[PDB]
């Protein structure tokens, strides 16, 4: 039972175009279980989740109602922020928040988080001890004085030390048949001629989960971490992920290279090389 | 379970 529950909030003002947009998506490691969008036509969570829909209607209505209270809070924040930085009313701005908690196999809380960002730049975050703040610039300092004067940290610490943890090890049990699982990577190595004296050796890893993974090449045992092209881990569109590492090799020594794959869904790190046919 | 924030920045 070693995972983490995290929420990613977004509030983007749309002056001169309409009303603000708000999104709040929930995550349990690399699996999204809930989604709250202010553009939704009927509150149905276009991201629903098995183990979530098994809770009553009280739960779904309760969360839906909290989310809407939060759209007002963030609407007040955008307007205050607009003032702290002396911005006009027309400019579109964004406010994002990231909060959650991590747990050990124990099941207990390992650490809690609560960070905010304005227009893509850090603004204010909650400290390791969950009792103090760290304001980036002098505007966040305004929010700092305000929050401690009202002793806001205590409500954040309480959510993280309680609700966050309590509900996590409830989603873990109600979905132990999906959240504690690991899908191993399918791996093969392709060969793509560049010309007469060169050719690319691409190592693929497909259909795995979680997203975490490490692809490494090697030339006669030497790590080629430097001259290796490596793409960003990408979703396949089915809860699974992909990634590939590539190295350029001279036509002929393409047997000296080996690809190494590390992944939780793997019993032991894998070693592979290109095989003609 | 969403956190209910009421204190704006």
């Amino acid at each position, epitope marked *: 039972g070693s995972h983490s529950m995290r929420y990613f909030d977004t509030a983007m003002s749309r002056p001169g175009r309409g009303e603000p947009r708000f999104i709040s998506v929930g995550y349990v490691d690399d699996t999204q279980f809930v989604r709250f969008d202010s553009d939704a036509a009927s509150p149905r969570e276009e991201p629903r989740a098995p183990w979530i829909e098994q809770e009553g209607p009280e739960y779904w209505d309760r969360n839906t109602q909290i989310f809407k*209270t939060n759209t007002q809070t963030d*609407r007040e924040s955008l307007r*205050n922020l607009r003032g702290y930085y002396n911005q006009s009313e027309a400019g579109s701005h964004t406010l994002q928040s990231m909060y959650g908690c991590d747990v050990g196999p124990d099941g207990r809380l390992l650490r809690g988080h609560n960070q905010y960002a304005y227009d893509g730049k850090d603004y204010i975050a909650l400290n390791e001890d969950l009792r103090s703040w760290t304001a980036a610039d002098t505007a966040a300092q305004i929010t700092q004085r*305000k929050w401690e004067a009202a002793r806001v940290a205590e409500q954040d610490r309480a959510y993280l030390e309680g609700t966050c943890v309590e509900w996590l090890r409830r989603y873990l049990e109600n979905g132990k048949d999906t959240l504690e699982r690991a899908d191993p990577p399918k791996t093969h190595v392709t060969h793509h001629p560049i010309s007469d004296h060169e050719a690319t050796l691409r190592c693929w890893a497909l259909g795995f989960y979680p997203a975490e993974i490490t692809l490494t090449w090697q030339r006669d045992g030497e790590d080629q971490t430097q001259d290796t092209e490596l793409v960003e881990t990408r979703p396949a569109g089915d809860r699974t992920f992909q990634k590939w590492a590539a190295v350029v090799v001279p036509s002929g020594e393409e047997q000296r290279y080996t690809c190494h794959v590390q992944h939780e869904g793997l019993p032991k790190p894998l070693t592979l090389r290109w095989e003609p046919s | 379970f969403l956190r*209910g924030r*009421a*204190y704006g920045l």
Partner: T-cell receptor
Amino acid sequence: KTTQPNSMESNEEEPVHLPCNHSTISGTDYIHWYRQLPSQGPEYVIHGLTSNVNNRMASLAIAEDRKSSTLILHRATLRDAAVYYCILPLAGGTSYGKLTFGQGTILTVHP
Amino acid sequence: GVSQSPRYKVAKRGQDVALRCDPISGHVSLFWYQQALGQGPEFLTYFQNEAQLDKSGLPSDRFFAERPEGSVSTLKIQRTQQEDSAVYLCASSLGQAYEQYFGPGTRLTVTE
């Protein structure tokens, strides 16, 4: 929604213990207290979450399970005579600050 | 502190009345409450700057509130009825969740 005694008595120079019950409170809910002196507007007294919030004139003690609380005036005076209200403005996250004064408690301070 | 006017008002059943509120300068949030004898104040409407975001407490259509530049606020009542007799309170604050500072309120009485 909270419930508290309709009235309470006390003599000047004495600590006053105003009780309050809030069974369905949330973990994110704050306990606020307001009072209203005769023919005046309501005014803020104190507010807390879990730990005891102390202050010169009034302190607040919150039950461990948080389903009940007490507002503590360390030394009542005639000016302390008024209506006290126990409130949960955030309502578990379903509200934003809007105040729901209930009936409150009318505190009479006898000289 | 917060100011309200008029402090007192007597109205004939059926006429319209206008109450005014001047919140502490700079305060973003502004709330309206209605308090009848022996009862505690009752939420009426709320303002986030100039925008009225919660009017869940307005008894009917007869009640209309505004706050043009997000400062001074007006509460107008059309066709006053006896059930309208109460003290109308006004409170402003730094933000929706911060401590509210109330005004002396307007004591309104509706007679036949």
